[PDB]
Design a protein around this ligand. Structure first.
Ligand SMILES: [Mg+2]
Lengths: 116, 116, 116, 117
């Protein structure tokens, strides 16, 4: 399976957040953010298949979740453009990284869940 | 100033939640809940003056926040009925507790900032 | 499968919150809280099999997640006794309820995810 | 008073996060991020005086917070490496914004309370 997964909940409607675009970036040697993977959440609010064990090498990764487009599709103009998290992926730690985001228009949390 | 302050905010609108009823109870030695203090939030979403240092001794306190009436006044019939925060106070000596309840119709977040 | 499920994450350690006790109550005619179901989260932070479609009738339910014992087991001082979620189950309403809780010692959210 | 205020709190300790670096940028017409204002949170966890009602015009603003240094100064090595939020301000007239970042080592919450001047 992908070592990096994303799950998104809509805390206003009490449902998975479906069709949310997610972009992942990796810091390059020149300190710029290089695009790494993208996708959108399914009907369960999950995004699987972003990357592979081979490709998900150690590095600094940025996960950006496009929450503004999600809310705007529901008719709402929310506070932020995105939810984001930056973290270092490490070969020593637990293998699987799940970014869990809980969304409301004016408050949201992004949590990294690192497991085996 | 009251050693217990409660603030209520709306996560959907990004606004203070005004006129929200807040009821505080203290657990008695016989395990029942005794009414302890109550009030309604102000225009800033804050409820000041609930109690005093002299009254607010160690104990288990329950803060019940009438979130149902608040949503209903905005034309929403919420899923999350009433918010309830239960905590032990002053166990290491008197502290000032600010409890913030952030509301949506299907979720709430409770945050405590505890100072000297 | 149980029409009421609970999933719990630890935001301090970035992990599922394992072995968290959960107690569910249903409001009785005398306005008291009847014990209804209980269990504890598994290694995945999920609690399955709490109740059945037959047992879970309309009513007012309280889900208490025993977060104080969880933080004590980790050596981390907590704020609350537990996280509570009170809701009315109406038959016109939702078919499956999942309570998703994100926990830190001094801040926590509980979200009802209502699905079919 | 500044119509943009940023507050940072610690969800592990239940305390204000003191002396935390906060950077604010505003998106220019050429799509670059221009430095707008910065400072460090005070003993209440709040950073006051960032801007004024005259200077804080409509635009896209970015608030970036050095949460990693905050945790390290407390003896904690965090997993999340910073906090960052981008938002359009004053799109429907001037507002006052309080942005609160609530931190733990593996998570953060961003909340905006938006009021009239
Ligand atoms: Mg004692």
């Amino acid at each position: 399976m992908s070592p990096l997964m994303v799950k998104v909940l809509d805390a206003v409607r009490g449902s998975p957040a479906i069709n949310v675009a997610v972009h992942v970036f990796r810091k390059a040697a020149d300190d710029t953010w290089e695009p790494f993977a993208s996708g959108k959440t399914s009907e369960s609010g999950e995004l699987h298949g972003l990357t592979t064990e081979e490709e998900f090498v150690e590095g600094i990764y940025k996960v950006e979740i496009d929450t503004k487009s999600y809310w705007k599709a529901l008719g709402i103009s929310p506070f932020a453009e995105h939810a984001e998290v930056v973290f270092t992926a490490n070969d020593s730690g637990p293998r699987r990284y799940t970014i869990a985001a809980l969304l409301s228009p004016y408050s949201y949390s992004t949590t990294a869940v690192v497991t085996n």
